[PDB]
């Protein structure tokens, strides 16, 4: 199994870069988890990594490329998922030299036997032989779809006489073997025989070894423990999650009607139940950015849809072409004080991708509410934090930030960056740390201590996200909301605090300061050690209540000669100097 | 085209007068039945011709008692079994002596489940000449054929013409297709010897082609026209992106086929499936209506016959009446039986007293039917239920009533507020005191084609003249559920608090009144009356035309607050400079 | 080969690396070739480890 690609004819680097990126892309590849591209190839190239390629999820692309075979032997099932041209599943142009020394001659795609959506578009090769001794309607799906075989060699051998006029090139080891077209009237699928009761299962693809649910190369809709169904158990029961039925949602993902999705519909909020979360019955809808989204940066046309967004439904990237504008698309430049926008969001549930931030900006503070990052959706694979090449940035600044709930993290290439060295990354980064931190090329331990550059003496053998205190992940003795310090003030001090899970509170404003023991043990009137004005039953005022409203109407008390109040008689008017009737004002 | 047929069994008709009319009004034009078809007990020479149209049967089909020669089910392709008539049957024919001469199923080629049982019908030719192991499934089944052959009659052999000898009826259109039995390979189903001939994976009677749009019946769901394992869902989920969306090609699961939206007086459901009662740990809500989750611990539901611990109850009595208190919506149905106004000597049970039927006063709606044979004769009607609105009728006496009335005696009806049966016939009979039932517009409660209104042995309609039983004049277009000015369905005048009148008291008269919509309502206590003008815009102190004793600004007031307030020179309220 | 230089009112198509090529192919169909630090259809994104 390894991740497709996106590049639309384009490549990168020299002959030989190119080679060595496709090579080690799907070196030992099965399942491409994407689109299979091969462009701008030299002759001289070893493609015999690629016979390991069973099944592709989107198109198969090779284009003006110059080498005698394809080496695609056990490929069975193109899904089509991803078409080229809105049209095209299979995609074949131009493969031969100009100057005709070299050119594509045989495709080698014996074992192809489904395509699940898309047509088949083979045109301009002019040393491509037998792409007219193929019978496309046997392997293509769709009845609708368009087919576009023509210009594709001249001189060409015939086929095989053992072939029966159809085959992938000059021999009996190409052969094509038919599965659709040869099947009993009753069958409308692929089969495994000629009998009516030889026919494939309706939920398999690619061909089938018998005509039971299990029996089946691939799947085309869920996968449940080695049989092909529709949906997945309902109510034992499973959940739906990827192609696949489990026992369990993850816990990164919010379950909508036994489905395990990215984001609720529309219509529905994510609510927290037990350890999982469910789609109910909205909030701002403050979608994200990236892969599935409907553009791949922040930039000068897109920021503004986060104005008060605190939960961004997707993945948040920024890419150099949305900050230093795109005249592609007639956009600005992204205006750098317009990122502020993003210290109302607390969760993004995909990934977080910097690849540039503005040269005057040595910090990510706008990120500082910043409290979850989900795995829901990963940047290409495993990874859900990449911060890479931000060459004036010295610290990283997520002062908030205390889980990754999946996904790996890529910190490399940043030359300043220098705090990060202490940052214990087990308490942050959910589950196993050992396998997935790739962090690298930042700036070195020995240059960033030897300057100074380490966290107060106060923050917690966790580590920090910068300079000072409130950066830390946790602090040695007490905090005072962000900021960490060495004491509370308790038994000294101007104003006075009490102790609640390690953090100091005040004491309320009419507590009297104690000297040698605690002031109070709560911010309430009632939580001081003694009252520093008067007293009205347990809770201490600053005077004897007047004009009070109750269950009984007015209420008036009078002071004490120790300073506690008492109720004045029933009969006086705006308060008393004592409890009888001639105490009255 | 679609019915759900009766409960019945054995039992006898409850009105031997109507039963024929029972069984053409919910059968006549059928195709397919949703529950089970049950013909039993009909006369010599009974008008069956209304049954040709029937195709498939959910249930099991029974036929028995009856005294005619053949019943006319040669279109009947499929039996499915989803309701056995006893121990593992889906075909019953029972003493049927006249008799039945013929079975004629010409078309039926497929029992899904069940066995045949076919005993004591000293008249019936062919039941043993059938190869019934044809027309069973492929699939497991006991398959218990228990064939009478004592006839007692010199019948035919098969025509001349009839490969094999196997034939439902003397004639040569009589004869048994085999479709099973002589297919090639593996086939369930099959036109013919050839594997060229076998019908499609999803065919169950049969097949006119190769293809899943060929069958004569399909095994799981018909989708439009095509045969299918599975009906589509509402909703459906992309692996590849991890989302769930709407399907715009969606559809609900009704009986054995896919629908748009679910028929009327049932419940959908967020899986698609129709309903008519909600899974556990659900509730209904309207919109129309539909079955919902409970997010947190449901409300308090009341419930009548036949559900929930009531489920083995057969009658209302004194021993479970007070079940019923506060209750608005009953989900269950509500019967009053000869024993719950009678006493009980085994259970130790008192009989209901009409004080205690009282309980019913706030009920405003019946998921099941209502069926009331005893009711206590101090009641000269059923005003208990002036306030019931709806009978969903859900849950059907004897598979067909939601609404019988048997040997009460009543002089009118009194249902005031009844609007609406949603399912089932209604039966009223032997009532030889009720007068008031061809002056209520029963067409206007009926929802469903197969709904009408049987009915013999009431009061003729010459006596209740006689006697000058008759709807109030202001009842509009003489419809009413008895004679008094408070029981019309609707009226051409005023409706005061339901009771319709003639003039509302607004211009003249010692209390005065106002006019809102089509009812007359009283003014506040502290409006002036004004002679031969209007002396209030609605039932407020600050609504007044003048006021009958002092103006305090926002309102008219009896007397002047102490606030405190004086009555100055125009007879209205000021606040007081001392305080 | 098969490859032309875009002209001045299409060179905009690629960014950081700006080398943009036409298809010889009756629909427009851009490439560009990326410098080794990137990729994408555009050469927008950085390459990776
Ligand atoms: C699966 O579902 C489909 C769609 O509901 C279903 O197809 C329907 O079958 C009925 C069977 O009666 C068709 O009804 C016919 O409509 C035509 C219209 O002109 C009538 O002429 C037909 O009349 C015949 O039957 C009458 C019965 O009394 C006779 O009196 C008359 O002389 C004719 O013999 C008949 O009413 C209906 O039109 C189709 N619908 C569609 C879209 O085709 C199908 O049967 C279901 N089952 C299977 C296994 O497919
Ligand atoms: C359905 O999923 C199961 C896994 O749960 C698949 O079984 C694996 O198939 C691969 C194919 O090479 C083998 O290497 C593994 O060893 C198999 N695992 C087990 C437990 O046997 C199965 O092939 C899938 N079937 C379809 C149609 O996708
Ligand atoms: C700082 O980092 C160390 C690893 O260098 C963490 O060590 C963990 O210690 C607990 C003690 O029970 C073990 O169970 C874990 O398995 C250890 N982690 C690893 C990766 O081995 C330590 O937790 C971190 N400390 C803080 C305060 O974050
Ligand atoms: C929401 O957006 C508007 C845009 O001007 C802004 O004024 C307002 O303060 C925002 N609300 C919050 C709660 O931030
Ligand atoms: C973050 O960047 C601003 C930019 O001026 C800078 O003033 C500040 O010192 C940095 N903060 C931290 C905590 O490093
Ligand atoms: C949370 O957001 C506000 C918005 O201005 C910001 O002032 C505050 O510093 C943020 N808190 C932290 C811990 O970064
Ligand atoms: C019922 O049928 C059986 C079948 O052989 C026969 O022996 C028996 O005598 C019949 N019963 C009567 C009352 O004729
Ligand atoms: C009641 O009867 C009157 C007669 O004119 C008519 O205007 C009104 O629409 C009727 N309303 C109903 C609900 O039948």
New binding site residues.
């Given amino acids: 199994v390894c991740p497709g690609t996106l590049n639309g004819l384009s490549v990168t680097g020299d002959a030989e870069n190119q080679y060595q990126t496709l090579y080690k892309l799907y070196e030992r590849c099965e399942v491409v988890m994407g689109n299979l591209e091969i462009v701008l190839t030299g002759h001289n190239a070893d493609l015999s990594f690629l016979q390991w390629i069973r099944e592709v999820t989107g198109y198969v692309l090779v284009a003006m490329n110059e080498f005698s075979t394809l080496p695609l032997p056990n490929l069975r099932v193109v899904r089509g998922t991803q078409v080229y041209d809105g049209k095209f599943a299979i995609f074949v142009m131009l493969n031969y030299n100009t100057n005709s020394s070299h050119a594509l001659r045989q495709l080698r795609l014996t074992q192809l036997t489904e395509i699940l959506s898309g047509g088949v578009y083979i045109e301009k090769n002019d040393k491509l032989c037998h792409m007219d001794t193929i019978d496309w309607r046997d392997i293509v799906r769709d009845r609708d779809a368009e087919i576009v075989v023509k210009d594709n060699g001249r001189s060409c051998p015939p086929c095989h006489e053992v072939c029966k006029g159809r085959c992938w090139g000059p021999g009996s080891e190409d052969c094509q073997t038919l599965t659709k077209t040869i099947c009993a009237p009753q069958c409308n699928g692929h089969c495994f025989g000629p009998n009516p009761n030889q026919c494939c299962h309706d939920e398999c693809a690619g061909g089938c070894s018998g005509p039971q649910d299990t029996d089946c190369f691939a799947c085309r809709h869920f996968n449940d423990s080695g049989a092909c169904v529709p949906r997945c158990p309902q109510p034992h029961t499973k959940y739906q999650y990827g192609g696949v039925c489990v026992a369990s949602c993850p816990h990164n993902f919010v379950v909508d009607q036994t489905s395990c999705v990215r984001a609720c519909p529309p219509d529905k909020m994510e609510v927290d139940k037990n350890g999982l979360k469910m789609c109910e019955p909205c909030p701002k809808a403050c979608e994200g950015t990236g892969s599935g989204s409907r553009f791949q940066t922040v930039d000068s046309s897109n920021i503004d849809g986060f104005v008060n967004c605190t939960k961004i439904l997707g993945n948040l990237d920024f890419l150099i072409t949305g900050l230093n504008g795109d005249p592609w698309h007639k956009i600005p430049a992204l205006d750098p004080e317009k990122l502020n926008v993003f210290?109302?969001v607390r969760e993004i549930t995909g990934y977080l991708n910097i690849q540039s931030w503005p040269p005057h900006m040595h910090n990510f503070?706008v990120f500082?509410?910043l409290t979850t990052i989900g795995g829901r959706s990963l940047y290409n694979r495993g990874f859900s934090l990449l911060i890479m090449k931000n060459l004036n940035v010295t610290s990283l600044g997520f002062?908030?930030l205390k889980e990754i709930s999946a996904g790996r993290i890529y910190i490399s290439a940043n030359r300043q960056l220098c705090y990060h060295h202490s940052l214990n990354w087990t308490k942050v980064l959910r589950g196993p740390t050992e396998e997935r931190l790739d962090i690298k090329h930042n700036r070195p331990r020995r240059d960033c201590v030897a300057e100074g550059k380490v966290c107060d003496p106060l923050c917690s053998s966790g580590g920090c996200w910068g300079p000072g205190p409130?950066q830390c992940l946790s602090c040695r003795n007490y905090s005072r909301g962000?900021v960490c310090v060495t004491h509370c003030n308790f038994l000294n001090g101007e104003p006075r605090e009490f102790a609640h899970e390690a953090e100091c509170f005040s004491c309320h404003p009419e507590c009297q300061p104690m000297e040698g023991t605690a002031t109070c043990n709560g911010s309430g009137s009632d939580t001081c050690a003694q009252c520093a004005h008067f007293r009205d039953g347990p809770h201490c005022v600053s005077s004897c209540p007047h004009g009070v409203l109750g269950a009984k109407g007015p209420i008036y008390k009078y002071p004490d000669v120790q300073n506690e109040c008492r109720p004045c008689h029933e009969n006086c008017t705006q308060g008393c100097k004592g409890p009888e009737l001639q105490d009255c004002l | 085209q679609v019915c759900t047929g009766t409960d019945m069994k054995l039992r006898l008709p409850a009105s031997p007068e109507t039963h024929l009319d029972m069984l053409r009004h919910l059968y006549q034009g059928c195709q397919v039945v949703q529950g089970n078809l049950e013909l039993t007990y009909l006369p010599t020479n009974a008008s069956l011709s209304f049954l040709q149209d029937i195709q498939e049967v959910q249930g099991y089909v029974l036929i028995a008692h009856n005294q005619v020669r053949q019943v006319p089910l040669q279109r009947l392709r499929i039996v499915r079994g989803t309701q056995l008539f006893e121990d593992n049957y889906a075909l019953a024919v029972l003493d049927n002596g006249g008799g039945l001469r013929e079975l004629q199923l010409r078309s039926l080629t497929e029992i899904l489940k069940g066995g045949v049982l076919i005993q004591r019908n000293p008249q019936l030719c062919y039941q043993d000449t059938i190869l019934w192991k044809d027309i069973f499934h492929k699939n497991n089944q006991l398959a218990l054929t228990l064939i009478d052959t004592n006839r007692s009659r010199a019948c035919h052999p098969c025509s001349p013409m009839c490969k094999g000898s196997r034939c439902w009826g003397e004639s040569s259109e009589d004869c048994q297709s085999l479709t099973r039995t002589v297919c090639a390979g593996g086939c369930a189903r099959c036109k013919g010897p050839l594997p060229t001939d076998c019908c499609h994976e999803q065919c169950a009677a049969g097949c006119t082609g190769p293809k899943h749009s060929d069958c004569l019946a399909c095994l799981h769901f018909n989708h439009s026209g095509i045969c299918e394992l599975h009906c589509p869902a509402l909703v459906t989920y992309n692996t590849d992106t991890f989302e769930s969306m709407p399907n715009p090609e969606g559809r609900y699961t009704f009986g054995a086929s896919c629908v748009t939206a679910c028929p009327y007086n049932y419940l959908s459901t967020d899986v698609g499936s129709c309903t008519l009662v909600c899974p556990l740990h659900n509730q209904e809500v309207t919109a129309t209506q539909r079955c919902e989750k409970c997010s947190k611990p449901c409300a308090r539901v009341c419930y009548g016959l036949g559900m929930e611990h009531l489920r083995e109850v057969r009658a209302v009595t004194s021993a479970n009446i007070q079940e019923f208190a506060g209750c608005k919506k009953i989900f269950g149905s509500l019967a009053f039986l000869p024993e719950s106004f009678d006493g009980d000597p085994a259970s130790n049970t008192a009989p209901l007293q009409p004080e205690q039927l009282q309980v019913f006063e706030t009920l405003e709606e019946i998921t099941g039917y209502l069926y009331i044979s005893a009711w206590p004769d101090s009641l000269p009607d059923l005003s208990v239920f002036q306030n019931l609105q709806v009978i969903r009728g859900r849950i059907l006496h004897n598979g067909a009533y939601s609404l019988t009335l048997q040997g009460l005696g009543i002089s009118w009806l009194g249902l005031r507020s009844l609007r609406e049966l949603g399912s089932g016939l209604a039966l009223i009979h032997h009532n030889t005191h009720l007068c008031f039932v061809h002056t209520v517009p029963w067409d206007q409660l009926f929802r469903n084609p197969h709904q009408a209104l049987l009915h013999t042995a009431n009061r003729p309609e010459d006596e209740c003249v006689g006697e000058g039983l008759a709807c109030h004049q202001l009842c509009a277009r003489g419809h009413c559920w008895g004679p008094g000015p408070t029981q019309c369905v609707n009226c051409s005048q005023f409706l005061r608090g339901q009771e319709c009148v003639e003039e509302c008291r607004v211009l003249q008269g010692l209390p005065r009144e106002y006019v809102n919509a089509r009812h007359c309502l009283p003014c506040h206590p502290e409006c002036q009356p004004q002679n031969g003008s209007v002396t209030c815009f609605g039932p407020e102190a600050d609504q007044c035309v003048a006021c009958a004793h002092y103006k305090d600004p926002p309102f008219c007031v009896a007397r002047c607050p102490s606030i405190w307030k004086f009555p100055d020179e125009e007879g209205a309220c000021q606040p007081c400079p001392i305080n | 080969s098969h490859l032309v230089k875009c002209a001045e009112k299409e060179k905009t198509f690629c960014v950081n690396g700006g080398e943009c090529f036409m298809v010889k192919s009756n629909p427009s169909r851009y490439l560009c070739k990326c410098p080794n630090e990137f990729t994408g259809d555009r050469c927008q994104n950085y390459v990776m480890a």
Wanted: proline letters at 0%; glycine letters at 22%; zero cysteines.
């Fill in positions: 210290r109302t503070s500082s509410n002062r908030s409130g962000g």
